[PDB]
Design an enzyme around this catalytic site. Structure first.
Site, mmCIF file in Angstrom:
data_model
loop_
_atom_site.group_PDB
_atom_site.id
_atom_site.type_symbol
_atom_site.label_atom_id
_atom_site.label_comp_id
_atom_site.label_asym_id
_atom_site.label_seq_id
_atom_site.Cartn_x
_atom_site.Cartn_y
_atom_site.Cartn_z
ATOM 1 N N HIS A 165 0.265 -16.910 -1.691
ATOM 2 C CA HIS A 165 0.256 -16.047 -2.565
ATOM 3 C C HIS A 165 2.036 -15.509 -2.721
ATOM 4 C CE1 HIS A 165 -3.594 -14.510 -0.777
ATOM 5 N NE2 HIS A 165 -3.942 -15.100 -1.774
ATOM 6 N N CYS A 266 -0.523 -8.383 4.318
ATOM 7 C CA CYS A 266 -2.048 -8.705 4.532
ATOM 8 C C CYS A 266 -2.931 -7.834 5.226
ATOM 9 C CB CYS A 266 -1.896 -10.002 5.107
ATOM 10 S SG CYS A 266 -0.819 -11.282 4.373
HETATM 11 ZN ZN LIG Z 1 -1.854 -12.026 2.472
#
Ligand SMILES: [Zn+2]
Length: 273
Positions: A165, A266
């Protein structure tokens, strides 16, 4: 004020994460017990130390990656966009997040477009605009829905070719400061992002790309606060953050979850009420 938050949503780790959690590389075995300790410390910093109201969601064994709540929701002011994860096995994670955010009385917007995918980890919110990474988890249609949901903010896309990401190598470290990895790929992505914006952002380069992922918060009684990786995990990067003398620096471990591609941002979704 950018970075201001009053509440934080987190989710407990399921036993299945150890062997069932998605990962780009199957190598070092995950120490589940240690992963739980690091999560407990992580939540302790946000709740006890910083005084945020913590909303703890129960773990779901059928959802090995349910701990990474950031990927299922993008919050901006009073509106929360419930995403449609690029990973099919993680889509049911939206159910409990939606309920949690609805309970917090936030404007809910769901990504029902069966042709659109978007992971929260691919979205970098600078407080002024959004940068959305185009990767294997997030596509053009997803970025478009984001721009439509938050019409009062500019949205620009950037290619994510080497990492999972966009936030695998960057994150906000201050009001106008972007922490960025020193890799050529990370630097190239930052150049593209900066070229699209009409605002000049300051950058803080760190030796370890994954250490560029940190959590910045602006606490009423403390001021600028930054959660970053520990000196034991990445000593060279922790040393760089030491330059931020006006920040309350807090070292937070996340070595076990990194094995399943999980970084600091996250595991939480910050909300300001
Ligand atoms: Zn993440």
């Amino acid at each position: 004020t950018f970075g201001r938050a009053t509440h934080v949503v987190v989710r407990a780790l399921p036993e299945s994460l150890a062997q069932q959690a998605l990962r780009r590389t199957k190598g070092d075995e995950v120490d589940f017990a240690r992963a739980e300790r690091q999560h407990q410390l992580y939540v302790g910093v946000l709740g006890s130390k910083l005084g945020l109201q913590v909303v703890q969601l129960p773990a779901d064994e059928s959802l090995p990656d349910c701990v990474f709540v950031e990927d299922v929701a993008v919050v901006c002011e009073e509106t929360a966009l419930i995403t449609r994860p690029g990973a099919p096995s993680r889509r049911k994670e939206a159910d409990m997040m939606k309920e949690a955010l609805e309970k917090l009385q936030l404007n809910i917007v769901e990504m029902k477009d069966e042709n659109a995918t978007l992971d929260g980890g691919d979205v970098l919110f600078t407080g002024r605009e959004f940068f959305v990474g185009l990767s294997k988890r997030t596509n053009q249609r997803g970025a478009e829905i984001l721009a439509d949901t938050f019409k009062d903010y500019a949205v620009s896309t950037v290619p994510v070719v080497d990492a999972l990401h966009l936030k695998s190598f960057c994150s906000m470290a201050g009001p106008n400061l972007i922490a960025i990895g020193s890799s050529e790929s990370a630097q190239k992505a930052l150049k593209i992002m900066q070229q699209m914006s009409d605002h000049r952002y300051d950058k803080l380069t760190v030796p370890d790309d994954t250490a560029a992922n940190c959590i910045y918060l602006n606490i009423p009684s403390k001021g600028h606060v930054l959660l970053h990786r520990t000196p034991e995990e990445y000593p060279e990067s922790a040393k760089v953050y030491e330059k931020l003398k006006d920040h309350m620096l807090i070292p937070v471990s996340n070595s076990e979850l990194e094995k399943v591609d999980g970084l600091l941002t996250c595991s939480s979704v910050l909300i300001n009420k």
